[PDB]
Amino acid sequence: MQPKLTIWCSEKQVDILQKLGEEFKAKYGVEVEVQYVNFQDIKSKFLTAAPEGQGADIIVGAHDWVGELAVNGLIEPIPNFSDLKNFYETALNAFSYGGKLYGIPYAMEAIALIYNKDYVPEPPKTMDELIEIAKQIDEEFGGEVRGFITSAAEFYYIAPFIFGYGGYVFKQTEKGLDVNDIGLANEGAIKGVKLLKRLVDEGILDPSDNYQIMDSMFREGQAAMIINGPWAIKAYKDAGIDYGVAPIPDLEPGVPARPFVGVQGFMVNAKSPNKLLAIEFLTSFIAKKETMYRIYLGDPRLPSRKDVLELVKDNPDVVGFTLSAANGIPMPNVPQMAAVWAAMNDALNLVVNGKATVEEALKNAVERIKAQIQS
Ligand SMILES: OC[C@H]1O[C@H](O[C@H]2[C@H](O)[C@@H](O)[C@@H](O[C@H]3[C@H](O)[C@@H](O)[C@@H](O[C@H]4[C@H](O)[C@@H](O)[C@@H](O)O[C@@H]4CO)O[C@@H]3CO)O[C@@H]2CO)[C@H](O)[C@@H](O)[C@@H]1O
């Protein structure tokens, strides 16, 4: 009886993984099934389905998930394999927790300014310049082209402002992250969210702006500038957008934006009876140079396998996202990160909708995060 491996991944990886799965099946007789799952639903679906025996054998996603999934016993440690040396240790360590490796990373990433050269031939260097250019576009195009869009109420996309001014999630200490020292309502976080509020107040961002609006308007030629990541670029290129990638404009003189840095990788379901075969598929096939490069070609981010990064290092998009990531802060992978996102999203929703001051919204967010961490 032929065995089967099921993979959950976002829309970005479906095509390339489908093709690789067909190749693995032709060679070995192992059925491979690639199932699209909305990215923000992968982890929550896996938390629900994995204990019920209904989780995918392999999930694809971000390294911040690792600590929560590892301590809950839901993802399987990956034993050493011959290709392990070929991956950057920073990428492997992002997928490591409690001394063990829990995923095969394929790329790192960070959001950046993505701009349509038809409207913005040369990218702004400061946020003050970006604000002026966006206002000009909003006026000159009578509302048919948005000057600037990002996901206004989503913490992941506002983090570059929060961190640029000195906010932080958990305090970085010489003994690791201090989950009892949260910096998402310090004066830097407040100044960064006050910049978000300025963008809304000056009409550059609309209270309803979200990921789908940003992504779709940019892909359809209706947005001059966005803040988004390298996962979005292939769709823009196929749609015919003449885009560029640049670091997010400095928040003010001498204060660069500092985005989250994320690592994307393949994790194995520890509850799956196929976990040994899933590991074999990842280490013997997915981890290889050609396969990792084919994944890049299908889903272009910043490759984690060193010899693949060398192939792409001169691509202007790779150069642009690397410049943005150079100022960035890696997302924590500790289990306590699960308590962070929803509280911060809720606080930013209140701010962009004029429902609370920045200081009150962030203060309440941190009390919510702390209470959840403490149990
Ligand atoms: O409680 C709210 C939600 O919190 C958790 O979601 C987190 C993620 O775990 C983080 O990784 C991050 O998500 C980023 C992601 O890192 C980044 O790559 C990008 O995601 C892309 C994706 O790579 C791409 O393949 C494609 O699917 O498009 C996505 C963008 O739409 O952007 C994400 C941010 O949107 O931050 C979120 C929280 O915002 C938790 O996993 C969720 O289950 C939970 O609902």
CSV table of C-alpha atoms and ligand atoms in Angstrom, one decimal:
chain,number,residue,atom,x,y,z
A,1,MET,CA,0.0,0.0,0.0
A,2,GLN,CA,1.5,3.3,-1.1
A,3,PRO,CA,2.1,5.8,1.8
A,4,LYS,CA,1.2,9.5,1.6
A,5,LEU,CA,2.7,12.8,2.7
A,6,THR,CA,0.3,15.7,3.1
A,7,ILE,CA,1.8,19.3,3.3
A,8,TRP,CA,-0.1,22.4,4.4
A,9,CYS,CA,1.4,25.6,3.0
A,10,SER,CA,0.2,29.1,2.0
A,11,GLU,CA,-0.7,29.9,-1.6
A,12,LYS,CA,2.8,31.1,-2.4
A,13,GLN,CA,4.4,27.6,-2.2
A,14,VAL,CA,1.6,25.4,-3.6
A,15,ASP,CA,2.8,25.3,-7.2
A,16,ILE,CA,6.4,24.5,-6.7
A,17,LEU,CA,5.7,22.0,-3.9
A,18,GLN,CA,3.0,20.3,-6.1
A,19,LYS,CA,5.6,19.8,-8.8
A,20,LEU,CA,8.3,18.5,-6.5
A,21,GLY,CA,5.7,16.2,-4.9
A,22,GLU,CA,4.9,14.7,-8.3
A,23,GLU,CA,8.6,14.2,-8.9
A,24,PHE,CA,9.0,12.4,-5.6
A,25,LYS,CA,6.0,10.2,-6.3
A,26,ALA,CA,7.3,9.3,-9.8
A,27,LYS,CA,10.6,8.2,-8.2
A,28,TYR,CA,9.5,6.5,-5.0
A,29,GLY,CA,5.8,5.8,-5.3
A,30,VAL,CA,5.1,8.0,-2.3
A,31,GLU,CA,1.9,10.1,-2.8
A,32,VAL,CA,2.5,13.7,-2.1
A,33,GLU,CA,-0.5,16.0,-1.5
A,34,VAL,CA,-0.1,19.8,-1.2
A,35,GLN,CA,-3.0,21.5,0.6
A,36,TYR,CA,-3.4,25.3,0.5
A,37,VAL,CA,-4.1,26.8,3.9
A,38,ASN,CA,-4.4,30.5,4.6
A,39,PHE,CA,-1.1,31.4,6.3
A,40,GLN,CA,-2.6,32.9,9.4
A,41,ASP,CA,-4.7,29.8,9.8
A,42,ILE,CA,-1.9,27.2,9.5
A,43,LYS,CA,-0.7,27.2,13.1
A,44,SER,CA,-4.2,27.4,14.6
A,45,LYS,CA,-5.5,24.6,12.4
A,46,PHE,CA,-2.5,22.6,13.3
A,47,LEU,CA,-2.9,23.1,17.0
A,48,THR,CA,-6.5,21.9,16.7
A,49,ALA,CA,-6.0,19.0,14.2
A,50,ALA,CA,-2.6,17.6,15.1
A,51,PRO,CA,-3.7,16.1,18.5
A,52,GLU,CA,-6.8,14.7,16.7
A,53,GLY,CA,-4.7,12.7,14.2
A,54,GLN,CA,-5.9,15.1,11.4
A,55,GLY,CA,-2.8,17.3,11.0
A,56,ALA,CA,-0.7,17.4,7.9
A,57,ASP,CA,2.5,15.4,8.0
A,58,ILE,CA,4.5,18.6,7.1
A,59,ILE,CA,3.6,22.2,7.6
A,60,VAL,CA,5.4,25.2,6.0
A,61,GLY,CA,5.6,28.5,7.9
A,62,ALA,CA,7.4,30.9,10.0
A,63,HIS,CA,10.0,30.3,12.7
A,64,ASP,CA,8.1,32.2,15.5
A,65,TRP,CA,5.9,29.1,15.7
A,66,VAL,CA,8.7,26.8,16.7
A,67,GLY,CA,8.8,27.3,20.5
A,68,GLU,CA,5.0,26.9,21.0
A,69,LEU,CA,4.8,23.9,18.8
A,70,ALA,CA,7.9,22.2,20.3
A,71,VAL,CA,6.9,22.6,23.9
A,72,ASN,CA,3.4,21.3,23.1
A,73,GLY,CA,5.1,18.2,21.6
A,74,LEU,CA,3.5,18.8,18.1
A,75,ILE,CA,6.5,19.1,15.8
A,76,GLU,CA,9.3,16.5,15.6
A,77,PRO,CA,13.0,17.1,16.1
A,78,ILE,CA,15.1,16.8,13.0
A,79,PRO,CA,18.2,14.6,13.4
A,80,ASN,CA,21.4,15.6,11.8
A,81,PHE,CA,21.6,15.0,8.1
A,82,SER,CA,24.3,15.3,5.5
A,83,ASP,CA,23.0,18.6,4.0
A,84,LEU,CA,22.8,20.3,7.4
A,85,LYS,CA,26.2,22.1,6.9
A,86,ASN,CA,24.8,23.8,3.8
A,87,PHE,CA,22.3,26.0,5.6
A,88,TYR,CA,23.2,29.2,7.4
A,89,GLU,CA,23.3,28.6,11.1
A,90,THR,CA,21.2,31.7,11.8
A,91,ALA,CA,18.4,30.1,9.8
A,92,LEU,CA,18.8,26.7,11.5
A,93,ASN,CA,18.9,28.4,14.9
A,94,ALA,CA,15.7,30.3,14.1
A,95,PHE,CA,14.1,26.8,13.7
A,96,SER,CA,15.8,25.5,16.9
A,97,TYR,CA,14.5,25.3,20.4
A,98,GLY,CA,15.7,23.7,23.6
A,99,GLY,CA,18.8,22.3,21.9
A,100,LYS,CA,17.1,20.6,19.0
A,101,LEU,CA,16.3,21.5,15.4
A,102,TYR,CA,12.6,21.6,14.5
A,103,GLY,CA,12.6,22.6,10.8
A,104,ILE,CA,14.4,22.9,7.5
A,105,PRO,CA,14.5,26.6,6.6
A,106,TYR,CA,14.3,27.6,3.0
A,107,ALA,CA,14.5,31.4,3.2
A,108,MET,CA,14.6,34.5,5.4
A,109,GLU,CA,12.6,37.7,4.8
A,110,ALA,CA,11.7,41.1,6.0
A,111,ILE,CA,9.2,43.7,4.8
A,112,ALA,CA,10.4,46.7,2.8
A,113,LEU,CA,9.2,49.5,0.7
A,114,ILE,CA,7.9,48.1,-2.6
A,115,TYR,CA,7.1,50.8,-5.0
A,116,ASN,CA,5.5,51.1,-8.5
A,117,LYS,CA,8.0,53.0,-10.8
A,118,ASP,CA,5.3,54.3,-13.0
A,119,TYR,CA,4.2,56.5,-10.1
A,120,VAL,CA,7.4,56.7,-8.1
A,121,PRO,CA,10.4,56.5,-10.4
A,122,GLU,CA,12.8,56.9,-7.4
A,123,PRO,CA,11.9,55.8,-3.9
A,124,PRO,CA,11.5,58.3,-1.0
A,125,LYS,CA,14.4,58.4,1.5
A,126,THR,CA,12.4,59.7,4.5
A,127,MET,CA,8.9,59.2,5.8
A,128,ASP,CA,8.4,62.9,5.5
A,129,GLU,CA,9.2,62.5,1.8
A,130,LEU,CA,7.0,59.4,1.5
A,131,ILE,CA,4.1,61.3,3.1
A,132,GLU,CA,4.4,64.2,0.6
A,133,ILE,CA,4.7,61.9,-2.4
A,134,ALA,CA,1.7,59.8,-1.3
A,135,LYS,CA,-0.4,63.0,-0.7
A,136,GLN,CA,0.6,64.2,-4.2
A,137,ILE,CA,-0.5,60.8,-5.8
A,138,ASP,CA,-3.8,60.7,-3.9
A,139,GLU,CA,-4.6,64.2,-5.2
A,140,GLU,CA,-3.3,63.9,-8.8
A,141,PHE,CA,-5.1,60.6,-9.4
A,142,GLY,CA,-8.4,61.6,-7.9
A,143,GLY,CA,-8.7,58.6,-5.7
A,144,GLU,CA,-8.0,55.9,-8.4
A,145,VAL,CA,-4.4,55.3,-7.2
A,146,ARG,CA,-3.5,55.1,-3.5
A,147,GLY,CA,-0.2,56.9,-2.7
A,148,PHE,CA,0.6,54.5,0.2
A,149,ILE,CA,-0.8,51.4,1.7
A,150,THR,CA,0.1,48.9,4.4
A,151,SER,CA,-1.8,46.7,6.8
A,152,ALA,CA,-2.5,49.6,9.2
A,153,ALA,CA,-3.8,47.7,12.2
A,154,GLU,CA,-1.6,44.6,12.0
A,155,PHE,CA,1.3,44.6,14.4
A,156,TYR,CA,3.7,42.7,12.1
A,157,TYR,CA,3.5,45.5,9.5
A,158,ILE,CA,3.8,48.4,12.1
A,159,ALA,CA,6.7,46.8,13.9
A,160,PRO,CA,9.3,48.6,11.8
A,161,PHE,CA,8.1,51.9,13.3
A,162,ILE,CA,7.7,50.5,16.9
A,163,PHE,CA,11.2,49.0,16.8
A,164,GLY,CA,12.8,51.8,15.0
A,165,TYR,CA,12.1,54.2,17.8
A,166,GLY,CA,13.2,51.7,20.5
A,167,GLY,CA,10.2,49.5,21.3
A,168,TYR,CA,10.8,45.8,21.7
A,169,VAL,CA,8.8,42.6,22.3
A,170,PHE,CA,10.9,40.9,25.0
A,171,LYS,CA,14.0,42.5,26.3
A,172,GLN,CA,17.1,41.1,24.8
A,173,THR,CA,19.5,40.3,27.6
A,174,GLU,CA,22.9,38.4,27.8
A,175,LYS,CA,21.0,35.4,29.2
A,176,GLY,CA,18.4,35.5,26.4
A,177,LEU,CA,15.0,37.1,25.9
A,178,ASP,CA,13.3,38.3,29.1
A,179,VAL,CA,9.6,37.5,28.6
A,180,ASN,CA,8.8,39.4,31.8
A,181,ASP,CA,10.2,42.6,30.3
A,182,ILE,CA,7.9,43.7,27.5
A,183,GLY,CA,8.6,46.9,25.6
A,184,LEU,CA,5.6,47.3,23.4
A,185,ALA,CA,4.3,50.3,25.5
A,186,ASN,CA,7.6,52.1,26.2
A,187,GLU,CA,8.2,55.6,24.9
A,188,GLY,CA,9.7,54.3,21.7
A,189,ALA,CA,6.7,52.1,21.0
A,190,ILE,CA,4.5,55.0,21.7
A,191,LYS,CA,6.4,57.3,19.3
A,192,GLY,CA,6.3,54.6,16.6
A,193,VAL,CA,2.5,54.0,16.9
A,194,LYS,CA,2.1,57.8,17.0
A,195,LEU,CA,3.7,57.8,13.5
A,196,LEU,CA,1.1,55.3,12.4
A,197,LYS,CA,-1.6,57.6,13.8
A,198,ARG,CA,-0.1,60.5,11.9
A,199,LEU,CA,-0.4,58.5,8.7
A,200,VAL,CA,-4.0,57.9,9.4
A,201,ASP,CA,-4.7,61.4,10.6
A,202,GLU,CA,-3.1,62.9,7.5
A,203,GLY,CA,-5.1,60.7,5.2
A,204,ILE,CA,-2.2,58.6,3.9
A,205,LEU,CA,-3.7,55.4,5.4
A,206,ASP,CA,-7.3,54.6,5.8
A,207,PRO,CA,-8.7,52.9,9.0
A,208,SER,CA,-9.8,49.9,6.9
A,209,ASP,CA,-6.4,49.2,5.2
A,210,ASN,CA,-5.4,45.6,5.6
A,211,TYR,CA,-3.2,43.0,3.9
A,212,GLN,CA,-5.6,42.1,1.1
A,213,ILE,CA,-6.3,45.8,0.1
A,214,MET,CA,-2.6,46.6,0.1
A,215,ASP,CA,-1.6,43.5,-1.9
A,216,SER,CA,-4.5,43.6,-4.4
A,217,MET,CA,-4.3,47.3,-5.1
A,218,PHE,CA,-0.5,47.1,-5.7
A,219,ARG,CA,-0.8,44.1,-7.9
A,220,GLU,CA,-3.5,45.8,-10.0
A,221,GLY,CA,-1.5,48.9,-10.6
A,222,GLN,CA,-3.6,51.1,-8.2
A,223,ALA,CA,-1.0,51.8,-5.5
A,224,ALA,CA,2.3,53.7,-5.7
A,225,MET,CA,4.0,52.5,-2.5
A,226,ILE,CA,3.5,49.7,0.0
A,227,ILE,CA,5.3,48.1,2.9
A,228,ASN,CA,5.3,44.4,2.3
A,229,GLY,CA,7.6,41.4,2.0
A,230,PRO,CA,9.3,39.3,-0.7
A,231,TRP,CA,6.5,36.7,-0.7
A,232,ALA,CA,4.4,39.3,-2.6
A,233,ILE,CA,6.8,40.1,-5.5
A,234,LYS,CA,6.3,37.2,-7.9
A,235,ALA,CA,2.6,38.0,-8.2
A,236,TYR,CA,3.4,41.7,-8.9
A,237,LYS,CA,5.9,40.8,-11.5
A,238,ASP,CA,3.5,38.4,-13.3
A,239,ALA,CA,0.9,41.1,-13.2
A,240,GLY,CA,3.3,43.4,-15.1
A,241,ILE,CA,4.1,45.9,-12.4
A,242,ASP,CA,7.4,47.7,-12.9
A,243,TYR,CA,8.3,47.6,-9.2
A,244,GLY,CA,11.3,48.3,-7.1
A,245,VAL,CA,12.4,47.3,-3.6
A,246,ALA,CA,14.0,49.7,-1.1
A,247,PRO,CA,14.4,49.9,2.7
A,248,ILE,CA,11.5,51.5,4.5
A,249,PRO,CA,12.2,55.3,4.6
A,250,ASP,CA,13.9,56.5,7.8
A,251,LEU,CA,11.3,57.4,10.4
A,252,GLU,CA,13.3,60.6,11.0
A,253,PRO,CA,16.9,61.8,10.6
A,254,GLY,CA,19.1,59.1,12.2
A,255,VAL,CA,16.3,56.7,13.0
A,256,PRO,CA,15.9,53.8,10.5
A,257,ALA,CA,12.9,51.6,10.4
A,258,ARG,CA,13.6,48.1,11.9
A,259,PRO,CA,11.3,45.4,10.6
A,260,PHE,CA,10.9,41.9,11.9
A,261,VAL,CA,13.1,39.3,10.4
A,262,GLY,CA,11.4,36.0,9.7
A,263,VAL,CA,12.7,32.6,8.6
A,264,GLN,CA,10.3,30.3,6.6
A,265,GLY,CA,10.8,26.5,6.8
A,266,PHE,CA,9.4,23.0,6.8
A,267,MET,CA,8.2,21.4,10.1
A,268,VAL,CA,7.2,17.8,10.7
A,269,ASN,CA,4.1,16.7,12.6
A,270,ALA,CA,5.3,14.8,15.7
A,271,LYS,CA,1.9,13.0,15.8
A,272,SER,CA,2.1,11.8,12.2
A,273,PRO,CA,2.7,8.1,11.7
A,274,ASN,CA,4.6,9.1,8.5
A,275,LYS,CA,7.1,11.3,10.4
A,276,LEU,CA,10.1,9.3,9.5
A,277,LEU,CA,9.2,9.4,5.8
A,278,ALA,CA,8.4,13.2,6.1
A,279,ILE,CA,11.9,13.8,7.5
A,280,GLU,CA,13.4,11.8,4.7
A,281,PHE,CA,11.5,13.8,2.1
A,282,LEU,CA,12.8,17.0,3.6
A,283,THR,CA,16.4,16.1,4.1
A,284,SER,CA,17.1,13.9,1.1
A,285,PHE,CA,15.1,16.0,-1.5
A,286,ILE,CA,13.8,19.3,-0.3
A,287,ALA,CA,17.1,20.3,1.3
A,288,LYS,CA,19.2,19.8,-1.9
A,289,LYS,CA,20.7,22.7,-3.7
A,290,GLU,CA,18.7,22.4,-6.9
A,291,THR,CA,15.5,21.9,-5.0
A,292,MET,CA,16.1,24.9,-2.8
A,293,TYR,CA,16.8,27.0,-5.8
A,294,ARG,CA,13.7,25.8,-7.6
A,295,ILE,CA,11.7,26.8,-4.4
A,296,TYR,CA,13.3,30.3,-4.6
A,297,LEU,CA,12.4,30.5,-8.3
A,298,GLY,CA,8.8,29.6,-7.4
A,299,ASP,CA,8.7,31.7,-4.2
A,300,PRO,CA,11.5,34.3,-4.2
A,301,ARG,CA,12.6,35.4,-0.8
A,302,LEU,CA,16.2,35.4,0.7
A,303,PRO,CA,17.5,31.7,0.5
A,304,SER,CA,18.7,30.1,3.7
A,305,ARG,CA,20.9,27.5,1.9
A,306,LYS,CA,24.2,29.3,1.5
A,307,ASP,CA,25.0,28.1,-2.0
A,308,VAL,CA,21.6,29.1,-3.2
A,309,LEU,CA,21.9,32.6,-1.8
A,310,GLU,CA,25.1,32.8,-3.7
A,311,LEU,CA,23.1,32.2,-7.0
A,312,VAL,CA,20.7,35.0,-6.3
A,313,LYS,CA,22.7,37.6,-4.4
A,314,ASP,CA,22.9,40.1,-7.3
A,315,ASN,CA,19.1,40.1,-8.0
A,316,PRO,CA,18.0,43.7,-7.3
A,317,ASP,CA,15.0,42.4,-5.2
A,318,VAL,CA,17.3,40.2,-3.1
A,319,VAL,CA,19.6,43.2,-2.7
A,320,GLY,CA,16.6,45.4,-1.6
A,321,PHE,CA,15.1,43.0,0.9
A,322,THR,CA,18.6,42.3,2.3
A,323,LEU,CA,19.2,46.0,2.9
A,324,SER,CA,15.9,46.1,4.8
A,325,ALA,CA,16.6,43.0,6.8
A,326,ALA,CA,20.0,44.4,7.8
A,327,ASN,CA,18.3,46.8,10.1
A,328,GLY,CA,15.8,44.2,11.4
A,329,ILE,CA,15.0,42.3,14.5
A,330,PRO,CA,14.4,38.5,14.3
A,331,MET,CA,11.0,37.5,15.6
A,332,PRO,CA,11.2,35.6,18.9
A,333,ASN,CA,10.5,31.9,18.6
A,334,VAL,CA,9.7,31.4,22.4
A,335,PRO,CA,6.3,30.0,23.3
A,336,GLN,CA,5.3,33.3,24.8
A,337,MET,CA,5.2,35.0,21.3
A,338,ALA,CA,1.8,33.4,20.8
A,339,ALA,CA,0.5,35.9,23.4
A,340,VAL,CA,1.7,38.9,21.5
A,341,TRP,CA,0.1,39.2,18.1
A,342,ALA,CA,-3.6,39.3,18.9
A,343,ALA,CA,-3.1,41.9,21.8
A,344,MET,CA,-1.1,44.2,19.5
A,345,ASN,CA,-3.4,43.8,16.5
A,346,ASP,CA,-6.3,44.7,18.8
A,347,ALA,CA,-4.5,47.8,20.1
A,348,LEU,CA,-3.6,49.0,16.7
A,349,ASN,CA,-7.2,48.5,15.6
A,350,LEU,CA,-8.3,50.9,18.3
A,351,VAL,CA,-5.7,53.5,17.4
A,352,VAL,CA,-6.4,53.6,13.7
A,353,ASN,CA,-10.1,53.8,14.4
A,354,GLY,CA,-9.7,56.7,16.9
A,355,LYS,CA,-11.1,54.6,19.8
A,356,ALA,CA,-8.2,55.2,22.3
A,357,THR,CA,-5.0,57.1,22.7
A,358,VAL,CA,-1.8,55.4,21.7
A,359,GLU,CA,-0.6,55.3,25.3
A,360,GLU,CA,-3.8,53.7,26.6
A,361,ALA,CA,-4.1,51.2,23.7
A,362,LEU,CA,-0.5,50.0,24.1
A,363,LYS,CA,-0.6,50.0,27.9
A,364,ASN,CA,-3.7,47.8,27.9
A,365,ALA,CA,-2.0,45.6,25.2
A,366,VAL,CA,1.0,44.9,27.4
A,367,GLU,CA,-1.2,44.2,30.4
A,368,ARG,CA,-3.1,41.7,28.3
A,369,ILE,CA,0.2,40.0,27.0
A,370,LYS,CA,1.6,39.8,30.5
A,371,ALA,CA,-1.6,38.3,32.0
A,372,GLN,CA,-1.7,35.7,29.3
A,373,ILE,CA,2.1,34.8,29.8
A,374,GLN,CA,1.6,34.5,33.5
A,375,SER,CA,-1.4,32.3,32.8
B,1,LIG,O1,-3.1,35.8,16.8
B,1,LIG,C1,-3.0,36.3,15.5
B,1,LIG,C2,-2.2,35.4,14.7
B,1,LIG,O2,-0.8,35.3,15.3
B,1,LIG,C3,0.1,34.4,14.5
B,1,LIG,O3,0.3,34.9,13.2
B,1,LIG,C4,1.6,35.6,13.1
B,1,LIG,C5,2.6,34.8,12.4
B,1,LIG,O4,2.8,33.6,13.2
B,1,LIG,C6,3.9,35.5,12.2
B,1,LIG,O5,4.8,34.7,11.5
B,1,LIG,C7,3.6,36.8,11.4
B,1,LIG,O6,3.2,36.4,10.2
B,1,LIG,C8,3.8,37.1,9.0
B,1,LIG,C9,4.6,36.2,8.2
B,1,LIG,O7,5.8,35.9,9.1
B,1,LIG,C10,5.1,36.8,7.0
B,1,LIG,O8,5.8,35.7,6.3
B,1,LIG,C11,4.0,37.2,6.1
B,1,LIG,O9,3.1,36.1,5.9
B,1,LIG,C12,2.9,35.8,4.5
B,1,LIG,C13,3.3,34.5,4.1
B,1,LIG,O10,4.7,34.3,4.3
B,1,LIG,C14,3.1,34.2,2.7
B,1,LIG,O11,3.4,32.8,2.3
B,1,LIG,C15,1.7,34.5,2.3
B,1,LIG,O12,0.8,33.5,2.9
B,1,LIG,O13,1.2,35.8,2.7
B,1,LIG,C16,1.4,36.1,4.2
B,1,LIG,C17,1.0,37.4,4.3
B,1,LIG,O14,-0.4,37.5,4.2
B,1,LIG,O15,3.1,38.2,6.9
B,1,LIG,C18,2.6,37.6,8.1
B,1,LIG,C19,1.8,38.7,8.8
B,1,LIG,O16,0.6,38.9,8.1
B,1,LIG,O17,2.7,37.6,12.1
B,1,LIG,C20,1.3,36.9,12.4
B,1,LIG,C21,0.5,37.8,13.1
B,1,LIG,O18,0.2,38.9,12.3
B,1,LIG,C22,-0.5,33.0,14.4
B,1,LIG,O19,0.4,32.2,13.5
B,1,LIG,C23,-1.9,33.1,13.8
B,1,LIG,O20,-2.4,31.7,13.8
B,1,LIG,C24,-2.8,33.9,14.6
B,1,LIG,O21,-4.1,33.9,14.0
